[PDB]
Amino acid sequence: QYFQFYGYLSQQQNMMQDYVRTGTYQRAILQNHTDFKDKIVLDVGCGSGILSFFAAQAGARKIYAVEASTMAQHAEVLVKSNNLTDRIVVIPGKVEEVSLPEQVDIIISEPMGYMLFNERMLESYLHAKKYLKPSGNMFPTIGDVHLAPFTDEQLYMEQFTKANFWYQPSFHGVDLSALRGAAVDEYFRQPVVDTFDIRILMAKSVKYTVNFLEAKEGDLHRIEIPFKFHMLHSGLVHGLAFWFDVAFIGSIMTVWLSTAPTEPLTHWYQVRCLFQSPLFAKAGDTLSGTCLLIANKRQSYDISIVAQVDQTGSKSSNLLDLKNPFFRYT
Amino acid sequence: QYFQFYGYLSQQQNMMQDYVRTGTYQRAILQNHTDFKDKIVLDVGCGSGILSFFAAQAGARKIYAVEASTMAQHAEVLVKSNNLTDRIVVIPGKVEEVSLPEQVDIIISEPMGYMLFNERMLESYLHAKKYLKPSGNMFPTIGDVHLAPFTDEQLYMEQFTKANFWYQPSFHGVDLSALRGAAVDEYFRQPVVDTFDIRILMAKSVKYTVNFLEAKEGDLHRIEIPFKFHMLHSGLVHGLAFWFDVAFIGSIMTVWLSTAPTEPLTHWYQVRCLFQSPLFAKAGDTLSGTCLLIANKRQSYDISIVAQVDQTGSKSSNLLDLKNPFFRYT
Amino acid sequence: QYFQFYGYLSQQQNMMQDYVRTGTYQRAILQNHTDFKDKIVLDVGCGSGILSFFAAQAGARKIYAVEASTMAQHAEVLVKSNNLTDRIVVIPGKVEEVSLPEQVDIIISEPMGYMLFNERMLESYLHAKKYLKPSGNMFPTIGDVHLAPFTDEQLYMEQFTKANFWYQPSFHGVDLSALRGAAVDEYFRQPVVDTFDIRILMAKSVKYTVNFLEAKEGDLHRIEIPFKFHMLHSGLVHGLAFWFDVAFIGSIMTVWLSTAPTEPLTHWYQVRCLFQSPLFAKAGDTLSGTCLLIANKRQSYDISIVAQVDQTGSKSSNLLDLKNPFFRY
Amino acid sequence: QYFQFYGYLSQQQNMMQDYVRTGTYQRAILQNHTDFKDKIVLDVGCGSGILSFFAAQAGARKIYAVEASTMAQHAEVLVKSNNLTDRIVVIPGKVEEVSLPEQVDIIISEPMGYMLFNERMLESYLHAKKYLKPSGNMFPTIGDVHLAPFTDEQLYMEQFTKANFWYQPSFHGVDLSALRGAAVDEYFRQPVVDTFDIRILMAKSVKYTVNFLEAKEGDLHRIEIPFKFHMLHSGLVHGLAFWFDVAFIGSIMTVWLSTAPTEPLTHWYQVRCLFQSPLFAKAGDTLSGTCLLIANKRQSYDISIVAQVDQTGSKSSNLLDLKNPFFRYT
Amino acid sequence: YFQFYGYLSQQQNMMQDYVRTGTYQRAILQNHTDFKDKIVLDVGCGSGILSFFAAQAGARKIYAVEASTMAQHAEVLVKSNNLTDRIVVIPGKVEEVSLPEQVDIIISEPMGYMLFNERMLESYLHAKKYLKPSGNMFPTIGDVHLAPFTDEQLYMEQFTKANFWYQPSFHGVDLSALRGAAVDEYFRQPVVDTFDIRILMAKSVKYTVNFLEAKEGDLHRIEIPFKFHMLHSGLVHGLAFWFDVAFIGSIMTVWLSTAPTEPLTHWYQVRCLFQSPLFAKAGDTLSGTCLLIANKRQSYDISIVAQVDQTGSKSSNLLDLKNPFFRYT
Amino acid sequence: YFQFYGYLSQQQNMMQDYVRTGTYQRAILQNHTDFKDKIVLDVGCGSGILSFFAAQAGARKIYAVEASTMAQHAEVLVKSNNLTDRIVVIPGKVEEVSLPEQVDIIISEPMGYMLFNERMLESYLHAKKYLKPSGNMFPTIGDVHLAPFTDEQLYMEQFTKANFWYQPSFHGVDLSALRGAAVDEYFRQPVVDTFDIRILMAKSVKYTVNFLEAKEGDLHRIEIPFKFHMLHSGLVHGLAFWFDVAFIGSIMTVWLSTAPTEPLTHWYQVRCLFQSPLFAKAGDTLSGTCLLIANKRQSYDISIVAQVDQTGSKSSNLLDLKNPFFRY
Ligand SMILES: Nc1ncnc2c1ncn2[C@@H]1O[C@H](C[C@H](CC[C@H](N)C(=O)NCCc2ccc(O)cc2)CNCc2ccccc2)[C@@H](O)[C@H]1O
């Protein structure tokens, strides 16, 4: 069901129209030509092949382009029509289940999901290091998740407006009221995907770093992100906002791709997890806690956020379902 | 304070734009020309004087046009510009307080309000019979208020949609939830003024008649309307719908002005009093009870509607303030 | 995985907002009170349980409300909070797998999908007849699929315009052109879910009836619909439009729920399947061919349409995937 | 019986949906926490109590929340349900008549009406300084009215289109013409409440400041606003536009709430006073005069505007009734 | 006028009056002996439709005359329908062209608004120079009807529109001085639309023209006296006009009526408003004259003078039939 | 021809374009030193609105020429606004009357659909025989803009609307022989209405007429070359037209635009279809010419020809601007 989605050219078209992402990848690869020139490359989850073509443009000798959806057939068509069949080898299948005839010098991929970790494609990316030669590189090389507390009364009250549909005593004779709390909980469990004005942020971001050269596939099963924010503004904290940056650390240039709200919009937007019970904070208070991601059987994570205002002892605890994201952007 | 808003020509313009009303009054008067020809007329609440002009067109000898608001000054200007100062005498003040130099053959007025009785102007109209000669007439002569049970899921649910604004636990940090019930109650206490399709009615209307020629002021202080509806459709009864007809019973013809939902729309629309607890009825059931209007000090009535489905014993008891209608029409 | 979608109250809220559908069902049930009064009822795929509450309003003795998704848990909460545990028993699971304690007098459901047959829920509905007493009834009792030829130059050309991205000869140094034909093919294979003005229909519709009391589950594995349209307007025929009507044939009255473009809009909208290549026809001409639906493993059908103008003999076909509809509304 | 309509939760809900207003008040209070922390506070015309709740969020020891309408009963319910009985005391009645057992450190209120002064609530706000310590503050602290000449052909001509309803010689046989000029005068006497594009303003605004810490209740009975505009565009001046800003001058930050047409729209919109006789001005001309506001018994003001182009001597004098605004925004 | 008639989009619009076309067909077909083997002149044939009806009734020769370039399209239609032996299209004005042969019957649709507009009836009468002794004419006679009406909404509309000019500063310009002239202009326009018969205040009066007897010159000055017996009281806002024609064949008489009690035609009905309305009591008498004088622009200058005999109130009105207001929507 | 302009109802309708009226008033009032104590000529004044604006800017004297019986209403307005000294109404066509004084500036609204319809620009230019060598014209220049568009619905309507003519037995008559001619007729109608800018497939090309420099005879034959760089792939169904004018004063230049990106005016925009649509890919070039030849009926015969340069594919049409189709 995950991979069927990706078999449609309508879907590929949509994915290729992120010009920030595509330009940044092309630059990371082309400006680090000595990391590709005459090298063996693995492209994990190539779709229609775009990153593999960039690797070929940078002079790679062979690129193994692995794709688990029927999009592999279309990649094969483009490889031939662009006269690169000697240089890009399309491999249908999951990177966990295919065979490479050869170890590689560098792995390239776009494994980032919403909040960095959605899709659990980072685990596939890390799994693929079994094909990596000693002292081989990975593009992207490291990933930083950023989180910061926000206030947004409008977003917060939206959840109740929607749930209150159920708070009526005679819907064609039926009293729906008993489901209102369940509706509220469900909406608050959905991470909210859209952008926002940076003015809603109440403290400087905290980060959590994954070095993909060092990290092990298993490490991503249980991710514990601690935080201690020093509040720069007084107000109601309605949740945490998330974005991420990744770096392509080449031998010539380090290139960054950012999905920060201070940067041009990408197809990852930003993500906000709401607290059903908001926390009041004054300037100078400290908002501490932990965000815990546990991998689930649906290409996703269960999210647990507990935060407290240290100076008052008010706590808020929040469970979210990263497999039911709410796409709010317009 | 009550008559202030009637002093404005913008408001007079709006009232004159009901062409169903204006045209029906003109027909009733002109077609009953022998009821006006060389007679003395009293116009109760003449506004800018339009009904008095109609009486004049039908050949009245003299018309005393009584007006409580500053609109009286504007009527006097129209009378003069229409070269009728000899035949229409504008008397500023309440019909209960002014003096007429003589008795009249016929009284004409537009005393009907929402649900017929709102404004308590019917009492002013009846009071004015102290000026009426024996066997004089009144136009309108009788009025029939009709009530029928309706179903309307959208209108009913709208009340909770609006009250649920208060059902939120952190409106800028404030828990508003405790006011939800009071907000619901307030909305249901407002009779709804708008129109509707006749297919929402669930039984044939019951009526209650006032003969303006025989009735006295005292009969309008406590208005008791029993009802027994034979339900023609099964479903949820959300309230009673109200409209009214008046007849101008002249010597030549009887002309009706109807505000029913089967008839062209007037500025009275129709009125619906909702039940906060709807009643389930099957076709063939009997919905019985009492609509009781008690006159109050704000030119209106305290409404009490008590209804029950006889076969099931489910009951609904409802209090409404006709002083504060919700104008819903768009 | 399929049923996970249905477990969300947001989705249920969206579904409940089809007031044409809900009001018609309530009417069908309440006006046919003798088909429910003191009867045993099966509600197939009850969601939050609304149809079951209607059967209870009509006086049913006992209603078994079967729901495959976790929405069953919410249905249960509503039955308890509405003081109806006496009369409605919620059974979590598919209707094909659960056990009921007794046979029933009437089955009620909303098994219709896009183009009537999508979801293959009609099969689950027919399957539920193993619980039905002899001379028991079903609500809906019959369903008619309707098809008619349409002209819509905007819709047809969109299929190519949407593929324009693929013409790029240098998308960051990559020629995408070789995939443009495939993008176009893919788009043409999507049935189009939206509504339209009836002025685009070039002939009175042809129908196909499924009688839910007579039909067997297996009859819906291969559905063959022939047509011969008599054209009432001249023009280009870009494809076939589909909608459906169901009838609740009660002892007291027959109530119809229609999704025709002449009736108020429902959450099923209407569906249009394009021909690869449009066909010209003049008023008075006839258009004939067949529509074949074959059930697949993804809760849907492969649709084959072949049609021709009888006079000129212009031929067009298409093979569409009802599992990948385009929601154009 | 001015306060009747404020006792309705439906009215309170409408008022509470001005999010610019609510957010700006909360920010002003929370960022100036030291002006509230452990202090005594008076809230004048608290309605449902929202500002009192913000003052409690900022750490106030005791808040006296005064409210003249039956909304006072609903505030008391919110105080109980938000667990603040020990800190917020609701006092039903007019601030001019109630007893307070204690002097206060700060007064908070939303006394502003259309054109700043409508409602005459500013007088009540100033009246309440009898409770304010000499060291105390008021939120808001100052208010600035801004006025500027505008051109708007469509607005100007609409008044005549409306009045021309009366310019007809046989409305069911009646010549209505003699009322046309009175209708025109009536429409021009109504200040227009709605918004507009700033491109209609023909000169930079002039302002008139009221310092709520300095002013006396009595200074608001007669308000004389002199103006002199240096015209920046040639054209016809159809009247004066008005808006207002208030500043909350805290010991920590000064926060502004603006109702300017360059700013996000509030429930005060902007107000335009039309000239029945427009004034022609060239760029570089000076348009001078006075706007005089005289308080009246209807909780409003009689407005007099006298304007001249200094270079040509072309004059315009206009009288308006702020008690009868026309709400044009749709 | 003839430029306008040259367009096929205009022809299409003209041909879509089904009441008119059907009635002309029944008149011609049902009087088949009036046509069977006869010589026909068709005055102003357009694309030729009436000539085709005459052929269908078995006429031997039909001379179809048309002044616009639509005559070229009529020629095409005749050839394509293989009727060149029996229908001869002659391009030009019937006044000026040549016919080889005298004819048994003339057919035409010479009726305009209020019957007389276009003055095409003078071309129809002029054509009789080609008519044999004992020849016929379809239509044979025409009746115009007039009746007083009351319509507050229509009346007041004229002032609402004219009151645009009643303002003292339209971008600095006082427009007021033109309000009276605008009012007069609107009241000079006959109003083309339909209405409910309940607005009529007296039984109609009629004026008849016998096309067999009448000469071209009889229509330069048309004087229509009237005396109405007012059946209802109210304000008389003007006169409503309509017409009937009869086709008097030897087998049957067929009527085409444009009355407000009859199915709508493309002529609708016409109302001439009175700027000063007249108050009438039931039983009063409204008398006066409607006078039509021919003008250079294919039309008439209209004068209506009316008074209520019992009160002496008079209303005098001038109208321009060359600038009708098409109000029908 | 001018008869329909004689009616106040038609003048009311024209006065309701507030974008037009406001822009002209701004042009004039902001350039007050161009009018102050000057002599002005107003070509086709109608009820006289622009002449009043020149008066507001302080003009000494304004000659307002009007060819229809609207001239009588203008003189009424002039007199009622107490301006009979300053504004002189001259009934007649400006080409058929003499004026008593040279002028410092000519004001007019000579633009028609596609800028040129009505041929009133020739009248505007003709009036330059009274303009002093140093004088100005308001508007001073006019740019007609064209761009290729895609609109399959508009294309198909030309055929659909002719379906009436297919019928082989309309009351026993076969109409089929006329359907072709019916289609050709609809095709020759330029289409007046508005549309979404998203239908445009390339950036516009312009053709400028400078009113200070042009001669009347220059407008008898107008050739407009174009080369479009296509920004989108797909079918080109025709060319869209609109126009801008500039009032180039000594103080400010004010533009009045009828573009589909601007608020709608009573000129709307105009579209002319090709008989057959052309396919082009993004990056292709679409080149051709629009040729306008003035005709006897105050209009133009329009010839449009286009080709895709990379493929040699061609279409064209010949349109009649005297018979536009008002679609809006
Ligand atoms: N002297 C007084 N003493 C006590 N109690 C008073 C006094 N004067 C006014 N009270 C009360 O005070 C309240 C009005 C407060 C202020 C209303 C404010 N001036 C406003 O929005 N004016 C524009 C809307 C409008 C109003 C009237 C009108 O004719 C036209 C337009 C509400 N503040 C607190 C607040 C803040 C945010 C959200 C909601 C509320 C009412 O409840 C009055 O009963």
Side-chain angles (χ1 to χ4, degrees), chain F residues 236-251:
Chain F
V236 182
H237 289 102
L239 299 182
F241 299 77
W242 63 92
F243 69 81
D244 302 340
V245 297
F247 304 87
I248 303 171
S250 74
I251 298 162

Side-chain angles (χ1 to χ4, degrees), chain F residues 110-133 135-152 154-202 204-214 216-226 228-282:
Chain F
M111 307 85 78
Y113 300 138
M114 281 183 66
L115 181 66
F116 300 108
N117 188 41
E118 305 160 42
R119 291 183 70 184
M120 199 181 163
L121 291 187
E122 291 162 66
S123 297
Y124 190 43
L125 295 181
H126 178 97
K128 281 203 291 193
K129 89 147 167 304
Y130 297 112
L131 185 63
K132 297 189 204 164
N136 198 3
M137 281 172 94
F138 258 32
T140 320
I141 70 171
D143 299 323
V144 56
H145 284 263
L146 28 160
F149 71 88
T150 187
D151 188 336
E152 60 281 346
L154 186 61
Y155 183 72
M156 200 46 55
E157 279 170 30
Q158 313 313 295
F159 305 103
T160 328
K161 279 154 49 181
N163 286 339
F164 176 89
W165 296 103
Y166 271 144
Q167 58 198 340
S169 182
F170 180 76
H171 300 266
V173 178
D174 186 348
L175 302 180
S176 275
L178 294 182
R179 187 265 181 181
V183 173
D184 295 344
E185 178 177 297
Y186 291 121
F187 263 93
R188 297 166 78 79
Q189 295 191 270
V191 174
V192 177
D193 60 353
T194 197
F195 53 76
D196 195 304
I197 52 167
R198 289 195 208 93
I199 72 167
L200 297 183
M201 278 170 313
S204 75
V205 141
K206 89 188 178 192
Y207 183 86
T208 300
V209 179
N210 174 345
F211 304 124
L212 282 172
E213 305 308 320
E216 170 167 13
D218 300 338
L219 302 184
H220 297 173
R221 189 175 165 91
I222 304 164
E223 189 173 74
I224 304 176
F226 55 82
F228 295 112
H229 292 77
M230 304 301 290
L231 309 171
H232 307 296
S233 294
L235 295 168
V236 182
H237 289 102
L239 299 182
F241 299 77
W242 63 92
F243 69 81
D244 302 340
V245 297
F247 304 87
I248 303 171
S250 74
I251 298 162
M252 274 183 209
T253 294
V254 173
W255 288 88
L256 168 55
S257 181
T258 60
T261 47
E262 301 299 335
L264 191 65
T265 70
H266 77 287
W267 289 283
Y268 304 90
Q269 293 90 33
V270 181
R271 283 180 285 170
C272 306
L273 298 159
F274 299 122
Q275 291 190 246
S276 279
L278 287 185
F279 178 78
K281 292 180 192 173

Side-chain angles (χ1 to χ4, degrees), chain A residues 247-261:
Chain A
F248 303 90
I249 307 178
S251 62
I252 294 161
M253 255 196 205
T254 293
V255 175
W256 291 87
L257 167 56
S258 188
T259 66

Side-chain angles (χ1 to χ4, degrees), chain D residues 2-3 5-6 12 15-16 21-22 44-47 50-51 66-69 71 93-96 110-114 118-119 121 124 267-268:
Chain D
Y2 164 80
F3 299 103
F5 90 110
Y6 277 131
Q12 190 67 199
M15 282 194 305
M16 284 173 87
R21 183 279 319 288
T22 307
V44 177
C46 72
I50 187 67
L51 303 193
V66 181
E67 170 54 51
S69 76
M71 190 57 58
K94 301 178 198 198
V95 73
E96 294 85 350
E110 187 193 32
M112 306 85 75
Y114 301 130
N118 193 48
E119 300 163 51
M121 189 168 173
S124 300
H267 78 284
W268 289 282

